[PDB]
Amino acid sequence: TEPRVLVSEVLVRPQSGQLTPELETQVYNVIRTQPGRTTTRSQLQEDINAIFGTGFFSNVQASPEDTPLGVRVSFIVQPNPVLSKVEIQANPPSVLPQATADEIFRAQYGKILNLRDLQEGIKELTKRYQDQGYVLANVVGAPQVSENGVVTLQVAEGVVE
Structure with missing residues (x-):
């Protein structure tokens, strides 16, 4: 089955401009990937789909950065x-x-x-x-x-x- 990595940090970021706190909250509401739990490739894709599912964004991607402490997962969204x-x-x-x-x-x-x-x-x-x-x-x-x-x-x- 799919390998897992511990996630150290989740960041939600605008691709450009600013991200409203209301929109950031929208992202946090629907993703499962979270600090101090594991995640997988598919879970990331599924989180991306759920962000799109909210309907507020034209583009969504997950950018993962490995560290000794776990992966820092950045969800980069374009309102x-x-x-x-x-x-x-x-x-x-x-x-x-x-x-x-x-x-x-x-x-x-x-x-x-x-x-x-x-x-x-x-x-x-x-x-x-x-x-x-x-x-x-x-x-x-x-x-x-x-x-x-x-x-x-x-x-x-x-x-x-």
């Missing part, structure tokens, strides 16, 4: 930017009103982008396609986020006739 807007990209024009992205996602504007809250809005978008007769509409790939906080959702809307 999402503030959500400025969500755009739908239908084409390689959207069959939904121009303003439907704003109607659904407006409430999340001006706050840090959270991908869980984004996904709830995506579900509501999907239901709107369905309401208008486009019952096979799917988001293509993952939401693309700009450093300026513009989220572009590529959608295979389908055609009806």
